[PDB]
């Protein structure tokens, strides 16, 4: 369990809902890349990885196909034991120290996501935001649950309230985590 | 409310002392229950929960399946580590250190740095390491950068200068930021 | 350039 560097080559995910799937590689808790299974392309998270590293997207499509085949057999073996919804933990914090004028990024850490089906959206003064919103894939955890991170590139003003709307089956109402400078 | 059946496969590699110690653990998970796994130290497929025996016994019986998984210590773990040295293990991001007074409390904001290895200390005037500081755990930004906020229970005086000493492997000399 | 290695999952018994 104890090691200098922990890596995952990779995190193979498939679920009955959709049916949707995910394939990504991780190193020391950070995502290297994710394979866009529909577009059949490898999307690297760093500019350094895009220039010096490559991955065959065919490996992901074949692995998810094995996962699709394996899931159906284990459902019958478990006697249709469905996944129980978990209460997620939402935390909102800035990337750099907040200073009016300097460009900053708002991070919305959504921990303990199970099953991996979540809607993370941003709200500024009650209005939905889509501009400058980036989202990472489902990052694996040791307890076999997931965590997703959402970003919001903004400029802190004199009066501008921000909220992170998280929609999950583990919650009856969408959880809102407020943030203000 | 909607019914969902989740399946997970995690092919993990554990590296210690570079290429000296390497361990592979392929985890087969149904929802959140890990039923089957293959440990490189074990050498064979083993059942974790009562949902694992049919899978583990079938994978151990097949000679081609066992030979492939045993060989994965060199074909994927040792192979990708050589590729990791050229990019990820060579990646060094210098942290941004700033002090903000929150006026009987000082916060040392160490922002955007890689790797995780960091040592932050709060000093009172000159060579007096304070023992009354509360540091936040290593915060993961997710975009290959880390941040750590070190708070200090401070009482100011007429001629008091508070310095924050930050050590990171990307720097040849530590970062010292003062506050008057 | 050399491609990244990947773990192949073992197929479950269909019988």
């Amino acid at each position, epitope marked *: 369990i104890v090691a200098d560097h922990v890596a995952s080559y990779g995190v193979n995910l498939y679920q009955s809902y959709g049916p949707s799937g995910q394939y990504s590689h991780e190193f020391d808790g950070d995502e290297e890349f994710y394979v866009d299974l529909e577009r059949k392309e490898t999307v690297w998270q760093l500019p350094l990885f895009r220039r010096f590293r490559r991955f065959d997207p*065919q*490996f992901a499509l*074949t*692995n998810i196909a094995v996962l699709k*085949h394996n899931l159906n057999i284990v459902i019958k073996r478990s006697n249709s034991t469905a996944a129980t919804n978990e209460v997620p933990e939402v935390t909102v914090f800035s990337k750099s120290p907040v200073t009016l004028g300097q460009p900053n990024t708002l991070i919305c850490l959504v921990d303990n996501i199970f099953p991996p089906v979540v809607n993370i959206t941003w709200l500024s003064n009650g209005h939905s935001v889509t501009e400058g919103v980036s989202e990472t894939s489902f990052l694996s955890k040791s307890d076999h649950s997931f965590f997703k991170i959402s970003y919001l590139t903004f400029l802190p003003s004199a009066d501008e309230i921000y909220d992170c709307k998280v929609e999950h089956w583990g919650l009856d109402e969408p959880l809102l985590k407020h943030w203000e400078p | 409310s909607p019914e969902d059946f989740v399946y997970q496969f995690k092919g993990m590699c554990y590296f210690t002392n570079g290429t000296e110690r390497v361990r592979l653990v392929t985890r087969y998970i149904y929802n959140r229950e890990e039923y089957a796994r293959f440990d490189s130290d074990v050498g064979v497929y083993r059942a974790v929960t009562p949902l694992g025996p049919p899978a583990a016994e079938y994978w151990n019986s097949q000679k081609e399946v066992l030979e492939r998984t045993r*060989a994965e210590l*060199d074909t994927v773990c040792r*192979h990708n580590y050589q590729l990791e040295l050229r990019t990820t293990l060579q990646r060094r991001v210098e942290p941004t250190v700033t002090i903000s007074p929150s006026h009987n409390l000082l916060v040392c904001s160490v922002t955007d740095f890689y790797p995780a290895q960091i040592k932050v200390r709060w000093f009172r005037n000159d060579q007096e390491e304070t023992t009354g500081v509360v540091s936040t755990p290593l915060i993961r930004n997710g975009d290959w950068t880390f941040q750590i906020l070190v708070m200090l229970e401070m009482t100011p005086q007429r001629g008091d200068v508070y310095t924050c000493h930050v050590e990171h492997p990307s720097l040849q000399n530590p970062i010292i930021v003062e506050w008057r | 350039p050399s491609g990244e290695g990947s773990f192949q999952p073992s*197929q479950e018994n269909p019988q």
Partner: T-cell receptor
Amino acid sequence: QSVTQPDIHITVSEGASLELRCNYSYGATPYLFWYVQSPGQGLQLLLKYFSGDTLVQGIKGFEAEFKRSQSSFNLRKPSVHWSDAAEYFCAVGETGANNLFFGTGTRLTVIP
Amino acid sequence: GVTQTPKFQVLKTGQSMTLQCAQDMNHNSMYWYRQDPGMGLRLIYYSASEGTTDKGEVPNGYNVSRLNKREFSLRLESAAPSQTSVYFCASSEARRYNEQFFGPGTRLTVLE
């Protein structure tokens, strides 16, 4: 990535030692294979290598040693049989590439 | 095992013929090759998984359709004398560098 076979046709007597030359282009972690193709039949894998011991033992009493410095994977047999009279192909692969490059093929005739 | 229908076929320049291939090994990847003397094996089309099709090195004058996990067919719209070759159908568990299991083969001769 490519594979080369210098021999096109080898004629040998039954019981005599065999050596089928095969050398590969490049590979960080190569996947080297050996296939046998009998007349009127398909290709059947004899032996394979990707990791472990350099000397690999395969089916039909065949063996091969992986030379990384010489970049070759020559197939050898101490005593050849009349049933071994078939076309031999050696394939190459890589860990991070879902592709397989087959050789031109070497014809083998064993006189009983 | 891999089953290929038919075994032999004689066609005229312009005729249409479909090569049916089936495997009972629960393999995801299925392949369609053509064996020619001196050239070796040249991949036409390959299906990595069900509902997925990709071009090989010689896909001109051919079209494929993956019906299910066990069946994969090779369709010829217009026959050409350059397509006169023995066709082999292969299958592997998931990747191209896995043990490939070949069928008996289908000899094809196109005449004007």
